[PDB]
Amino acid sequence: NFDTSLPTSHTYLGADMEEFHGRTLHDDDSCQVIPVLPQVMMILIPGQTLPLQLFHPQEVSMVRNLIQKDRTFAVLAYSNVQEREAQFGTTAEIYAYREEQDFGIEIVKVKAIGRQRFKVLELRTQSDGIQQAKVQILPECVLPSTMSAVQLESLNKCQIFPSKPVSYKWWQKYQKRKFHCANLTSWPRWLYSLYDAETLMDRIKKQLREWDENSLPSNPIDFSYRVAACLPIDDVLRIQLLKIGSAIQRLRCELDIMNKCTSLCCKQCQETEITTKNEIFSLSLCGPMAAYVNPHGYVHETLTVYKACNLNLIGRPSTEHSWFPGYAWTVAQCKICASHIGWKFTATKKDMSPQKFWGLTRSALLPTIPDTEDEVILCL
Amino acid sequence: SYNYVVTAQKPTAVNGCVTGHFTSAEDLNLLIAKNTRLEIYVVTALRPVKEVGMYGKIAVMELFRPKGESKDLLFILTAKYNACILEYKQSIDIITRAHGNVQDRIGRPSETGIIGIIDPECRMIGLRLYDGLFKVIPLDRDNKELKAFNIRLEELHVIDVKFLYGCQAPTICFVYQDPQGRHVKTYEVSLREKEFNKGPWKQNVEAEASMVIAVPEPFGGAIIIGQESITYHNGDKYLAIAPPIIKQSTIVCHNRVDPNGSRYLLGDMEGRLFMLLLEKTLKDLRVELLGETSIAECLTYLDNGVVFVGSRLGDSQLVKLNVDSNEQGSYVVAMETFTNLGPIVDMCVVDQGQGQLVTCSGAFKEGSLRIIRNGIGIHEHASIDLPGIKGLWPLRSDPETDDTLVLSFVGQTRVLMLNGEEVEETELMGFVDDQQTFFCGNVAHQQLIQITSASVRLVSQEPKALVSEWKEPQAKNISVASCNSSQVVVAVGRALYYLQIHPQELRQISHTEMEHEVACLDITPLNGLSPLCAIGLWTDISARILKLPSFELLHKEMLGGIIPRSILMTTFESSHYLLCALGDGALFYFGLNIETGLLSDRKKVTLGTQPTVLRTFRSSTTNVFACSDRPTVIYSNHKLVFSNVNLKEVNYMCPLNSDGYPDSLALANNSTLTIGTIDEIQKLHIRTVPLYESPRKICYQEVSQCFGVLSSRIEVQDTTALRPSASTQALSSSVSSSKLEEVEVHNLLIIDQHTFEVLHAHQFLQNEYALSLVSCKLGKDPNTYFIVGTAMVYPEEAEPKQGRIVVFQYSDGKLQTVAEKEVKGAVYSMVEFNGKLLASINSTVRLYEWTTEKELRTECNHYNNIMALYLKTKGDFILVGDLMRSVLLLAYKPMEGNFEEIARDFNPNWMSAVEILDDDNFLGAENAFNLFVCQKDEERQHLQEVGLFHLGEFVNVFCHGSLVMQNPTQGSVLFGTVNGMIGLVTSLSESWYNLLLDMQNRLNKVIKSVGKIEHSFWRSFHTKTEPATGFIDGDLIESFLDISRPKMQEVVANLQYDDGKREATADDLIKVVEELTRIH
Amino acid sequence: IRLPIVDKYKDMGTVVLGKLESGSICKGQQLVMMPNKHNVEVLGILSDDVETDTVAPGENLKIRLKGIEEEEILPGFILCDPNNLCHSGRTFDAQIVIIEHKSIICPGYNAVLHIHTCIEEVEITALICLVDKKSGEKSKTRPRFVKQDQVCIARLRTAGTICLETFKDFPQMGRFTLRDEGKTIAIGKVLKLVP
Ligand SMILES: Cc1ccc(NC(=O)NCc2ccc3c(c2)CN([C@H]2CCC(=O)NC2=O)C3=O)cc1Cl
């Protein structure tokens, strides 16, 4: 096997960039103005990493000066139907940056990380091809436990337990002690358990484990956003989760998709299977999916999968600008429709694990719920 | 949409309970918190003294004596962090010495909950509200605004904290938990520096230690209770016992028996009461099993070995604990039971004229049905088996107070003498006893009178005997007679005579003739003798008034139809009414003119199809008793106000005032005479049907005249139960399947509606959890069915993947299982939907048609984002909700055979209950004990939030229904609660909402609020915090009636009252608020 | 080693300028200097203001050379280690991103070609295979020409002689910018070297 921390550090971008420790979060419900870079179209999730390559001096200006102050710019969710009425989005904060003029056009490569969700109020258009967006921060809306309302005061003293050994009787125990006072309400322990952040996160962990070898956030907010970015879903569904204001509802709806969406199809010709859930695994620490930039500055949320069907390969394996040090890429396209689905990755050393695997772009895919037995998914 | 919220049953459940000297230094009091209410009793070997209401959930309540104060003061801290210090004042005020809201801008509320403590020297109140901080209020004489300061805690997870006794500076002892384990520590609280100083001692305690007990100052020190171990600490003395007798469960409440601290009471989580003893200084500990009580939330030792058990899950108690333990068993015995409806976990409204409410109340051994009927109760002092009474009269064998009861049967009469409480048959000399008596009584000129069918009979009192008789001039039968102190008017069918009463003579006067055969008469005076007459004729079916001697009465109001049975002139408040009651059960009630003659301001109301009889009686003013299938008392406050009487039918009555039964009543039906005193006025009467297991749902099958109840019980592993339950003691019982650490076993009960016997217990499948229950007809099938929704629950499988919809039917004495459907998930709810069955299975809604092959055939299927936990309907609409407070409006489209989402509002907060108010409005209970309302009115697929209100209770159920007979306000929803409060919600016109909103504000200036908490702070929607809206607190409006006349005028001072507009008076409001009180 | 020579300022016996892009360079270390295969020993290494005896990549050397060729050496030659020395000749293939152009560049387009120190006029003799930017996807057909904002692979003759390396094989000496009317009109990694 191979070093899973390598792909998330985007070493293919260049050796060292100036790094920025942290620190800027804007307090909730505020009204901010943030620049939005043009041509970047991606629905960006808190905690997700975003690599960029900027070519136009418009963009290259906007950033060079952005570094001095805030370092954060604005990324927009568009339903394609919007045609510019962008209505929600996400702050991304630059944590790494490099400005090369070697080739002899000036090129700016950056690594940003999604920070906050906002609502669009207005969009004003600096005639420099850049937007500056009037933007109200959305608070992550946090709920106490389901029991904190109905809890007998005498049993408060029992609500903290000794912490879990690092094995599932513990969860039966957990359920029995935490949701004891269900008897005062009109539902069972096992229901209140289906809205328990701690439980849901654990149920999600087990699926993520299948991806293998896992640690990660303890806060449900972060966890829910981390698995949100792992989910290969479609830009219209991705805006839905993002719009969702509870961690609990995020985790729940997220478990739904992971069970309900076994197959992954050619998005263009629709009724062709490329790959399955079975085949997804996390080459990157960050998930079975991350964002990667290519050399022409195009962004690819690519999904690492072990086999996959109904593709052609064109050309020969190349390590040029490869996102996965150790592997070469060959362009993959839909056997039927020719529409470019991703890449097949191939080892250059015979002592690496996965000798081959597919990396499939999310733009090229359509998650399906198998059958015509309730077959357009709605997140739950 | 604008709504009125009012309480119909105050919360019953006990939060907390304390003793000490509050009312008076010499008295010993018990102070009890029942959520928003505070009861004050004086102990004797409990006399209620004062009960009041916080604008608050009482969350801490302690008594304490500051230096140089004459009795104890009372600290309350509410769930909204409203502090106050309170004094009793002698007629009685509870006054607020000090108050302040001790909220902080930052601060995560602690997982272990709010914890209030007062040190023994009364230096400070110590508050633990948030993790990391310990708040201190100095008790300095000059701290009226309870200003306070925080001390940082390194330790973030504090389990429990107490001040210690016998320290040279105030000292806290607490248990906390971190990664290295659980530990007890102490701090010295430096009053001056406002910091902790390294405490006298510390110590890794038991893993699950959770209770701190501070021992008073002979031994001083602390006791620490866990699961297995009880441990004592002071400095570096240390005792640790681990007795088996507390192995089985968890000690959750405690209390000191004596000042010494020799003895402590300890309460189990499942109903054991223990005594802990400290042996002497401190050398050993022994715990001893007193027995079983209601599951205790809090305990107080009172005196003479009597103990108050405050319950939440069950009825609260008084228990006597003997040092004689019986071989009945261990040593505790019940003295009193105090009703607790708490957990109202589900309910339904039944029955046919004035509806009554049945609940699933309690939990584990405390599980019960509660039946709640609005009512005037009657305390019985005698019942006598005495069939056939057809009239009743009190009488006085001596000139003062009745001593004689006269009863009539068909063509027969008989006399009872009363000596104290012993009734004995006698003869009255002068009274014929072989005819039926129509009236008798004491009369004018030291005399007596019997009016039979035959004759009208004047009798003397000193040497009793018949001084004059009157019969018809043609020796005929009397049909109907009416007599007062001085006069008689007797009818003979068609025509009728007026008679007087002088000594030895009853001499005739007027001998008139009527349209048709007179059916009822009256002569009740309004000033010694009645110058007027009430009549009712057989065939013109009319209530006529006539002049005396003359008889040309006039104002002869021909009501419609059926013959009149009774008629009466009487006086409520001071207005004068005429009442005429029909043989169909109707009752017409007109205005009267004693001096004018006109009968007017007509209203009419029905009481029950069996013909009605009307009597006057005193209980200090005058009311009317109305006998029929449903007996009714009448008053009054300038409405006449019918009030059902808590009794099976009363055929006849009279007032009865004896040396044995003073200011009492005599009630006769077909087979019994009853003598009783009668409560004024109507309260909620609760009948309690113990099940000894947890009831979970209830619904009503009217044709089977019985209830279905889902319930569950706890067995321990082979599986075999911990006690006899409803479900183990049914007459007939079934099981879903044969036998081919605690467990939960679900049952459907069939409870009789009359006897509340458990007729049948069905047991569902092993692992099968019964979720939903419902009674209804389906398709075109005349049968009514019980229908259960289940879900198959395994611990390994976190989401339910299979469940049943089962159709039962109860005919004869047998429960048949008629039809099943397996379904690939949980059936969280069901609801009858236009003769189809609508069920929510996970996040699908499914509508089933009921075939003739007698099976459910899926018609349609709708998937939502939301799990469908709540379902309700009206007309074509479906209201769907989930735990998270997300709501969906759905519409059945008959021409498409299909469902359609109409509106939705996802607004993430814990939701406990929903209801439809009408096509356009939706009620909900939501986190931090709130109510809210959604409204319907493209972008018409958005629901608007038009109402919020901080209730103070956690609603488990809404249900349409009332508890006052049929019929200002519009519609009615009742709601049931964890604390055992029952409420009512109803709509107001925008006119009344505006008026009552003004009123609230004006009543706020006038009413004294207990902790000096502002009403609007209290009602303000809480989790976020916003002002309350679109709700009117009827609890507040109704208190208008309790303030003094000058305060009433204060409140109405500058108001435009609204009809046809002008300066509003106290009287305009008194009548408005009274109409308002009449909706429960 | 590899030092693209910027200029020769005959001084002393002789001397030469550059940035030193492959390897370390020891005082008196016999070398060669390309297309012409001229031997030469380092005499003098006046790196930066300072002299040092040996010096590693990055630095800015002037170097006194002794050889049969002592001016008559031009910029866009390079020094080379004699073992693995530098590839060269005058045709080559490369991947050439068109950044600025009004119309449609197309084979037998003439332009200037700045590779490292060298600056020789060049023709793209044919172009080869288009390539789409989103993918990597080489192209199916040949392309008759390449417009702006677009990538191709193409073969290139310098109307004299160069000293190339392939990108990957080397980078600083195989990235290069076509340039015309003093604008930058493409940029290109060199791939092969033809004959
Ligand atoms: C000045 C210049 C500019 C660009 C290029 N390279 C190109 O045009 N090169 C064509 C090219 C275009 C797009 C992509 C690639 C190569 C490779 N690739 C993915 C494959 C999977 C991976 O792991 N990393 C990726 O980036 C692309 O999206 C050369 C020069 Cl000299």
Ligand SMILES: [Zn+2]
């Ligand atoms: Zn395709």
